[PDB]
Amino acid sequence: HHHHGTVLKQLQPPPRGPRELEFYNMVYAADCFDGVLLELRKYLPKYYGIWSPPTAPNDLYLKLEDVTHKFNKPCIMDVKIGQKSYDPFASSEKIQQQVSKYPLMEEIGFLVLGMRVYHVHSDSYETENQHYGRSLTKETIKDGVSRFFHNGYCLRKDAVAASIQKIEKILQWFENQKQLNFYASSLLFVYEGSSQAEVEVRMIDFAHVFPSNTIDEGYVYGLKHLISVLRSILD
C-alpha cells in the first residue's frame, strides 16, 4: 500500500487517517459477527495493527499484508473504482480539482492509476504512472487495460484476465448487497509474470468509506464497466 514482511500504510492527516483506521479495525474486530463485514475480509489485505516509528509516536501506520509476496516477478495494476473520485463532503473546489484530474471518470467508471508489468522479453519491468490512465478514453480504454496483461513476448495472459474477472465478479456480488459506501477506493491486481492462473484482486484505499443507505451504485457501476472491458479483452 506504501512502504516497508508486511507493508506499512501511512495514515493520512485527520479526518482521513482516523477514518481508514476505523474501517480496518471494524472489519477485523475480534468480536465481529457481521456476515457482510466477515465476508469483506476475503477481499482485503490482512491487517496486523498499527505501528509508529520510535522517533514520531504521533505518526501512525497500518501493518498490512504484502499481497505481492508469494509471487516471483509480480505484475501489479492499481485501478480506482467508481464514478466519483471524491466523497460527498468534498467542497466545490475539491470536486472541481478531482473532476478536472479525469473528467471521463463519470462515464468509464474506473481509472487506471499505475501498472508494473513483468516482461520476460527483457527481464525488465514496464511501468505506467498517473498520467497514462488519466489519458485513456472510451476508445482507447480497452487497449489501455490490456497493456497490463502482455507478459513478455509470448502469451497475452488470457488465463490471467480470466482469473481477474472471476475474483472481481465475487466483489461484484458482495457490493450487490451492503451498508457501506466506498469513494476513491481501488482494486489491486497482481498476477505472476513468470513462474516458480494464480492472481490477487484486493480492495485497498479506505480513507473515504462511509456508512450507507444503501447500495453503492457508483461502485457497482465502475465494477460493471471494468468487467466489461476485461470481458472483451478476453475476446
UniProtKB/Swiss-Prot annotation:
Residues bound to ATP are K9, E65, D66, V67, D78, D205
The protein's location, in the record's own words, is: Nucleus
Q: What is the effect of changing Q98A?
A: Strongly decreased enzyme activity
Q: What is the effect of changing D78N?
A: Loss of kinase activity and ability to execute necroptosis
Kindly indicate whether the keyword Lipid biosynthesis belongs to this entry. no
Acetylation is among the record's keywords:
yes
For this protein, what does the record note about how its cofactor is bound? Binds two Mg(2+), but the interaction with the protein is mostly indirect.
The UniProt-reported impact of Q98R is: Decreased activity with inositol 1,4,5-trisphosphate. Increased phosphorylation of inositol 1,3,4,5-tetrakisphosphate
GO BP term, example: necroptotic process
Residues binding substrate are: R16, K80, K94, I95, Q96, Q97, Q98, V99, S100, K101, Q130, H208
State the reactions this protein catalyses. Answer: 1D-myo-inositol 1,4,5-trisphosphate + 2 ATP = 1D-myo-inositol 1,3,4,5,6-pentakisphosphate + 2 ADP + 2 H(+); 1D-myo-inositol 1,3,4,6-tetrakisphosphate + ATP = 1D-myo-inositol 1,3,4,5,6-pentakisphosphate + ADP + H(+); 1-octadecanoyl-2-(5Z,8Z,11Z,14Z)-eicosatetraenoyl-sn-glycero-3-phospho-1D-myo-inositol 4,5-bisphosphate + ATP = 1-octadecanoyl-2-(5Z,8Z,11Z,14Z-eicosatetraenoyl)-sn-glycero-3-phospho-(1D-myo-inositol 3,4,5-triphosphate) + ADP + H(+); a 1,2-diacyl-sn-glycero-3-phospho-(1D-myo-inositol-4,5-bisphosphate) + ATP = a 1,2-diacyl-sn-glycero-3-phospho-(1D-myo-inositol-3,4,5-trisphosphate) + ADP + H(+)
Which pathway is it part of? Phospholipid metabolism; phosphatidylinositol metabolism
Q: How is its activity regulated?
A: Inhibited by flavonoids that occupy the ATP-binding pocket. Inhibited by myricetin, quercetin, luteolin, kaempferol, isorhamnetin and diosmetin, and to a lesser degree by rhamnetin and apigenin.
- Which cofactors? Mg(2+)
| Any one GO CC term of the record | cytoplasm
Q: Name one GO molecular function term.
A: inositol-1,4,5-trisphosphate 3-kinase activity
Keyword vocabulary terms for this entry: Acetylation, ATP-binding, Kinase, Lipid metabolism, Magnesium, Metal-binding, Nucleotide-binding, Nucleus, Phospholipid metabolism, Phosphoprotein, Transferase
Where does the UniProt entry say this protein principally localizes?
nucleus
Q: In which tissues is it expressed?
A: Ubiquitous, with the highest expression in skeletal muscle, liver, placenta, lung, peripheral blood leukocytes, kidney, spleen and colon.
In short, the EC number is 2.7.1.140, 2.7.1.151, 2.7.1.153
| Entry similarity comment | Belongs to the inositol phosphokinase (IPK) family.
* General function of this protein: Inositol phosphate kinase with a broad substrate specificity. Phosphorylates inositol 1,4,5-trisphosphate (Ins(1,4,5)P3) first to inositol 1,3,4,5-tetrakisphosphate and then to inositol 1,3,4,5,6-pentakisphosphate (Ins(1,3,4,5,6)P5). Phosphorylates inositol 1,3,4,6-tetrakisphosphate (Ins(1,3,4,6)P4). Phosphorylates inositol 1,4,5,6-tetrakisphosphate (Ins(1,4,5,6)P4). Phosphorylates glycero-3-phospho-1D-myo-inositol 4,5-bisphosphate to glycero-3-phospho-1D-myo-inositol 3,4,5-trisphosphate.
Q: What is this protein called?
A: Inositol polyphosphate multikinase
- Organism of origin: Homo sapiens (Human)
Organism lineage reads as: Eukaryota, Metazoa, Chordata, Craniata, Vertebrata
| The encoding gene | IPMK
Which residues of the entire protein appear here: the answer is 71 to 415 of 416
